[PDB]
Amino acid sequence: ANEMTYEQLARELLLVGPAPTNEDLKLRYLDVLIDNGLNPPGPPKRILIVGAGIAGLVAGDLLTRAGHDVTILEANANRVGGRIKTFHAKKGEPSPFADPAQYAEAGAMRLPSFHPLTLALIDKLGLKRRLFFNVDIDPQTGNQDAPVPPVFYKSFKDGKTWTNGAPSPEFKEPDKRNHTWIRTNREQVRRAQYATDPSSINEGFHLTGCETRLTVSDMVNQALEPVRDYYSVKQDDGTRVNKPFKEWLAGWADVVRDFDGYSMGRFLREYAEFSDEAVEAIGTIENMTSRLHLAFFHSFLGRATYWEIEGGSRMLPETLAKDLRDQIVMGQRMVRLEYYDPGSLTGPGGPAVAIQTVPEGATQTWTGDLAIVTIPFSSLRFVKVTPPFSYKKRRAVIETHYDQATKVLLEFSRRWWEFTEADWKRELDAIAPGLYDYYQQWGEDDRPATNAYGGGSTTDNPNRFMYYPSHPVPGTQGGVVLAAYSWSDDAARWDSFDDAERYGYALENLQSVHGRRIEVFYTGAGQTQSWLRDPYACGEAAVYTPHQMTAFHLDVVRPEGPVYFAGEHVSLKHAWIEGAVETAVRAAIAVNEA
């Protein structure tokens, strides 16, 4: 009965269908979203969708295009897209950065190539995608002028493959350079230096013995290898292939069983037997610190390739919205939801769903035959739901935590991160004679040139993670850095500062890593995003605690009479867009054939 549950969860995880068939639901979603859409088996239905983030838009588009009467209620008054949010200049208000060409991501910023549906959907919309440099690169290497590789998916069904165009064999990502920084414990090296000799940064973390000699990267990878062995095999090639479907699924089932009880921290301590100092170091270097006490699965799931969308992530939501001007109602917030499930405004023969919204944050009533709720559970918590959902669904709405996240963006007049030392001499002397020599004397609070292209630097200071844009905005001399990106307590302290203080601290921190002298190129333009203070999100992502997945995720996905659910949290890919998209499709399929 437990084994039965683990099997069911693994199917959820791996997108596998019921037993007499074992379908590749990745193929079904691709087909439907991309190739064919939906065909209604009978008359169009009235359908209501709450939330005009990516999940609500995707399902809205599919159900509209198949001929259904769709209404999309979005609490936000001026913005669709939810946790897809770009700071961009818009005609009629001042530009978010001094240079009005500049833009930057408030929310989602990178898309994995092991995430097909979202990449397929971007291509289908004829949006242009480029490589997101998660590690800093050599930009006089690779071939990015060649066409973007088509989406290429391989099924477990054997020989079944899905693509959306012809190969691009001459396309090639740039070499990773790893010239960016690790600054922990008042020590500082380049990622490449750490890789060749990790003791430098490890002694600062007070790792001793055989740990000192190992990178945090290798530690985490080795730790996970036995886990991986449950559903796959490292061949003599040194490569990894999934086992046969049965032993591959039972394996993932046995992963659920043996490891959902753990947090990442307890896994590293207890299973991989690492020192508290190693876990400390792993957390800081590998962005795990604040999620160590949360489910191992959250960290476990998520040289791979990442993608950004020319013009910012917003293009994906906004493009979809163009097809749905007629269906999208902005500035309406669901406060009540009533539905009729055989086994006041609803009933037999009357409408089966009734939603009531209020303006912004008047009292409209909306009715229909079926519903999709795509709003985060944080926000669902404060909606009055007339017949309660199932016990475990209600528990899921109560118990699912959302992590705080804040981003802090600083515009620079130049892309100082690229500069060689020589570049710094040129670029400072250009502002005033002697300015190089000045910053050279003055020095720092108790730095060599970064000379990096994309990627980011990692630190223990509150900024934590600093990302450089992967691609320059055509024709501009400057760029926007993600100066601070932090979670949990840090975020909350970032939030409670004044704009000036927050941008001051973010710059002091950037300066601690990069040099005082970066101050000269700051334009005084900064933007902040505080996902906790977002009324319609209250965080970045649904992050589960140990055993939560096991105890109620199968109830998260279930319909509730005529009410269906989609969104990032509905999937087992928490913190990603694919999950919201996979589940939008899934939802859309379901309400179509009801």
The binding site comprises 55, 74-75, 83, 109-110, 334, 379, 568, 576-577
CA distance 496 to 413: 28
Residue tagged 């990773």 (tokens): 176
The contact pattern for ligand AKG, residues 274-313, with x = CB under 6 A and - = no contact, is ----------------------------x-----------
Q: Taking CB under 6 A as the rule, does residue 110 contact ligand AKG? A: yes
Closer CB to a second copy, 118 or 290, in the complex = 290
Q: Positive or negative, the Cα torsion across 485, 490, 491, 495?
A: negative
Cβ neighbors of 555 (< 8 A, separation 6 or more) are 390, 392, 393, 395, 396
Closer residue to ligand FAD, CB minimum distance, 262 or 494: 494
Name the strand (E) or helix (H) holding 336. strand 332-339
Partner from Zn ion, ligand FAD, a second copy, none contacting 385, C-beta within 5 to 8 A by type: none
Per partner kind, with CB cut-offs from 5 to 8 A, the member of ligand FAD, a second copy, Zn ion, none near residue 145 is Zn ion
* DSSP letter for each residue of 119-142: HHHHHHTT--EEEE-SS-B-TTSS
State the nearest-atom distance from the C-beta of 449 to ligand FAD, in Å: 28
Backbone angles phi and psi of 271, in degrees to 5? -85, -50
Q: In the structure encoding, which two tokens stand for residue 306, read together?
A: 């990442």
CA distance 151 to 31: 13
Nearer to ligand FAD, 262 or 576 (CB): 576
Alpha carbon distances (Å) from 427 to 3, 349, 410, 420, 514: 64, 74, 19, 10, 15
Q: Interface residues for ligand AKG in 527-546 (CB under 6 A)? A: 540-541
- Helix, coil or strand: residue 178: coil
Strands 69-74 and 46-50: parallel
Please say which residue, 5 or 523, places its beta carbon nearer to a second copy.
5
Residue whose CB is less far from ligand FAD, 14 or 52: 52
Which one among 9, 73, 397, 575 touches ligand AKG, defined by CB under 6 A?
A: 575
Q: Which residue is nearest to Zn ion (CB)?
A: 145
Does 50 participate in binding ligand FAD (rule CB under 6 A)? Answer: yes
Residue type, 483: A
Q: Kindly tell me which of 47 and 106 has the beta carbon lying closer to Zn ion.
A: 106
Strands 370-373 and 46-50: parallel
* Distance from C-alpha of 455 to C-alpha of 466, rounded to nearest angstrom: 9
Q: In this structure, what are the phi and psi dihedrals at residue 524, rounded to the nearest 5 degrees?
A: 70, 10
Interface pick for ligand FAD out of 7, 14, 48, 53 (rule CB under 6 A)? 53
Determine, following the binding rule CB under 6 A, whether residue 576 of this chain makes contact with ligand AKG.
yes
Q: Does 109 bind ligand AKG (CB under 6 A)?
A: yes
Give the residue numbers of the binding site for FAD: 55, 74-75, 83, 109-110, 334, 379, 568, 576-577
| Partner from ligand AKG, Zn ion, a second copy, none binding residue 39, C-beta < 5-8 Å depending on class | none
Closest distance of CB 337 from ligand AKG, Å:
28
Q: For residue 83, state whether it binds ligand FAD (rule: CB under 6 A).
A: yes
What residues form DSSP beta bridges with 31? none
**Contact status, residue 218 vs residue 209, Cβ threshold 8 Å:** no
**Binding-site string for Zn ion from residue 127 to residue 166, where x marks contact by CB under 5 A and - marks none:** ------------------x---------------------
Q: Residue type for 498, please?
A: D
Does residue 54 interact with ligand FAD by CB under 6 A?
yes
Quick note: the x/- pattern for ligand FAD over 316-355, rule CB under 6 A, is -----------------xx---------------------
497 vs 388: CA distance, rounded Å: 40
CB of 358 to ligand FAD, least distance (A): 9
In the set 33, 34, 73, 396, which binds ligand FAD (CB under 6 A)? 73
d(Cα 570, Cα 354) in Å, to the nearest integer? 22
Q: How far apart are CA 401 and CA 235, in angstroms?
A: 39
Rg (CA), the chain: 25
Q: Identify which of residues 87 and 339 has a Cβ nearer to Zn ion in the complex.
A: 87
With contact defined as beta carbons under 8 Å apart, do 371 and 355 qualify?
yes
> What's at 408, amino acid-wise?
V
228 burial via Cβ count (<10 Å: 0-12, 13-18, 19+): middle
List of residues contacting Zn ion (CB under 5 A): 145
List of residues contacting ligand FAD (CB under 6 A): 50-56, 73-76, 82-84, 107-111, 333-334, 374-376, 379, 405, 407, 531, 536-537, 540-541, 567-568, 575-577, 580
List of residues contacting ligand AKG (CB under 6 A): 109-110, 302, 540-541, 575-576
